[PDB]
Swiss-Prot record:
The keyword Lipoprotein does not apply. Residues 1-147 form the Globin domain. O2 binds at H64. It is found in: Cytoplasm, Sarcoplasm. This is Myoglobin. GO terms for molecular function: heme binding; metal ion binding; nitrite reductase activity; oxygen binding; oxygen carrier activity; peroxidase activity. The modification Phosphoserine is found at S3. Its EC number is 1.7.-.-, 1.11.1.-.
């Protein structure tokens, strides 16, 4: 369980993300695909992209990054009360996309890396610790929902 003060560190950096959600989404997905190339294989829509330049030029990937970060932002704004938001996302990612918990750890690492690079004004050690706690809570709750849904994760 996060404290209110931890939630405020999360939401304070997220407000900066929201100045340019599309650019942040590009950076985060590219970082994920570069650090853990196996994750790109999960995306039938994107797995043909060969280089960072093609990723950056892909209008479809940009759109998808907006979708992902807007969904995550709506979860974070719930400050842990995210049961309704998690249901549909857990179901699609367990049953259709088949995204293991290890890959949600990889995107969490990519989010942290980009925030650390872009926002050292709002992403010092305490803020990063709060964000990590929020992402760990998200992954814990997704893992619980995956088990309910029948997916090992
Ligand atoms: C912060 C974590 C994540 C969030 C909030 C998120 C959110 C979303 C949303 C909102 C969608 C569209 C609606 C849906 O299908 O549920 C989506 C689609 C998808 N996600 Fe995620 N996602 C996350 C992590 C991941 C990871 C780590 C992978 C793969 C390694 C992944 C793979 C996919 C795939 C394959 C699709 C379908 C894309 C398409 O063809 O349209 N997601 N995600």
């Amino acid at each position: 369980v996060l404290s209110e003060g931890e939630w405020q560190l999360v939401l304070h950096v997220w407000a900066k993300v929201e100045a340019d959600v599309a650019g942040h989404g590009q950076d985060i997905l590219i970082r994920l695909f570069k650090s853990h190339p196996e994750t790109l294989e999960k995306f039938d829509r994107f797995k043909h992209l060969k280089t960072e330049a093609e990723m950056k030029a892909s209008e479809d990937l940009k759109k998808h990054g907006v979708t992902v970060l807007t969904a995550l932002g709506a979860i974070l704004k719930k400050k842990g009360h995210h049961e309704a938001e998690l249901k549909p996302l857990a179901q699609s990612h367990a049953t259709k996309h088949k995204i293991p918990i290890k890959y949600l750890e990889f995107i969490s690492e990519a989010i942290i890396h980009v925030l650390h690079s872009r926002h050292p004004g709002d992403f010092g050690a305490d803020a990063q610790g709060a964000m990590n706690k929020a992402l760990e809570l998200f992954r814990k709750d997704i893992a619980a929902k995956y088990k309910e849904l029948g997916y090992q994760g």
